[PDB]
Design a protein around this ligand. Structure first.
Ligand SMILES: *[C@@H]1O[C@H](CO)[C@@H](O)[C@H](O)[C@H]1NC(C)=O
Ligand SMILES: *[C@@H]1O[C@H](CO)[C@@H](O)[C@H](O)[C@H]1NC(C)=O
Ligand SMILES: *[C@@H]1O[C@H](CO)[C@@H](O)[C@H](O)[C@H]1NC(C)=O
Ligand SMILES: *[C@H]1O[C@H](CO)[C@@H](O)[C@H](O)[C@H]1NC(C)=O
Length: 344
């Protein structure tokens, strides 16, 4: 079947099947201009047994790019423009069409916390303030909600959307944690008013949780309180991400990070999604234990490594970083085929 993704118990129900899922991050899939490259990539993800793909739902600019380059929104103090042409949201339309064809579901965030592909900084350039006042900047929020409406209305009745996601890794450095609680409450309510078929999630990294060991990611320096956020009624499941190399922790500390977050989701009566993770050094050795911990911990509904790498019919490779797991590689065998085999 092909139905809307729902929650049954503290598990996800994907096309009528209730149970744990594995997926992957492919931010760059949304910006491919050759349709054939979307299809080859999705064919590989599908044949590997993954069910869910996370793709960027944004591409924000202040200056229009060179003619032919992709852009989804131009942010200006004198009138913003949402691009629904061929070099705009039509690229994301084909992504959703290809997900429908390949029996894949998509997680789509609407804005980046970070300045890659514009982010909150692109709104600050147009609307003033700074990265922490963005959440309550009326002009910036009015345009952000216009952009949310533009994306959600295209795909509200598609069965290929796993969930709408308020942003990629929202933070409010040094802020009261209530700033993101109130913003996330209001914006998730808005998304539910536009679409009653789909699940909604925050997209945060999971920072701020008091049941940990006191390392910086468990403190409240980034404006987020995990337990407070996952109790928001209009958020259906929790997300958390994991990067020991960026956070100054060791890799094995990641097991406790999964366990504490899973317990907080289950206490709020909802599944958790282990939505990003990576190790720069020895990824097969260091990430395999995390995949096993997630699969065997109550409260966890699925996991999505960062990130898929692939190559195209013309011989070009995809965008990549030090965490990329290239399709058909030895690390694809260790972290993709062996993991999918262990799930089922
Ligand atoms: C951001 O703007 C707010 C309001 O003016 C201010 O209180 C805060 O210090 C600013 N952040 C930085 C990093 O300057
Ligand atoms: C689309 O989904 C909305 C709920 O989000 C529902 O009200 C509407 O009837 C659906 N449209 C069609 C044509 O079925
Ligand atoms: C992947 O590896 C298999 C061999 O296991 C091969 O048949 C197939 O062509 C490869 N896919 C690509 C895209 O190279
Ligand atoms: C790393 O971190 C934990 C504490 O965070 C410590 O108990 C453990 O021994 C360390 N593991 C390695 C392999 O460094």
């Amino acid at each position: 079947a092909s139905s809307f993704v729902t929650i049954s118990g503290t598990q996800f129900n994907i096309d009528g099947k209730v149970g744990y899922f594995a997926g992957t991050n492919c931010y760059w899939c949304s910006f491919l201009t050759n349709h054939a490259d979307v299809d080859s990539t999705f064919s590989h993800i599908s044949s590997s047994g993954l069910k869910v793909v996370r793709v960027w739902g944004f591409n924000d600019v202040n200056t229009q790019p060179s003619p032919g380059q992709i852009w989804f929104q131009k942010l200006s103090a004198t009138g913003s423009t949402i691009n629904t042409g061929a070099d705009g949201l039509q690229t994301l339309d084909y992504v959703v069409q290809s997900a429908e064809q390949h029996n894949l579901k998509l997680i789509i965030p609407f804005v980046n916390n970070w300045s890659d592909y514009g982010g909150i900084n692109a709104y600050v350039n147009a609307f003033g303030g700074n990265a922490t006042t963005w959440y309550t900047n009326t002009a910036a929020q009015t345009q952000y909600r216009k952009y949310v409406q533009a994306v959600v209305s295209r795909y509200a009745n598609s069965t290929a959307i796993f969930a709408w996601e308020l942003g990629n890794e929202p933070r409010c450095n040094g802020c009261s944690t209530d700033v993101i609680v109130q913003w996330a409450t209001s914006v998730s309510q808005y998304v539910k008013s536009l679409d009653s078929n789909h699940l909604v999630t925050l997209g945060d990294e999971g920072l701020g949780l008091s049941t940990g060991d006191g390392a910086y990611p468990y403190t409240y320096g980034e404006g987020t309180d995990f337990a407070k956020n996952v109790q928001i009624k209009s958020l259906d499941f929790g997300t958390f991400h994991l990067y020991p190399d960026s956070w100054g922790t060791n890799y094995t500390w990641g097991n406790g990070w999964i366990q504490t977050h899973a317990a907080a989701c289950l206490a709020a009566g909802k599944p958790c999604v282990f939505e990003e993770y990576g190790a720069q050094q020895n990824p097969c050795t260091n990430e395999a234990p995390w995949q096993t911990t997630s699969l065997t911990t109550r409260g966890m509904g699925g996991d999505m490594f960062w990130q898929w790498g692939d190559t195209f019919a013309n011989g070009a490779q995809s965008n990549s970083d030090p965490y990329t797991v290239w399709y058909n590689s030895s690390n694809w065998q260790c972290l993709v085929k062996n993991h999918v085999d262990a799930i089922n």
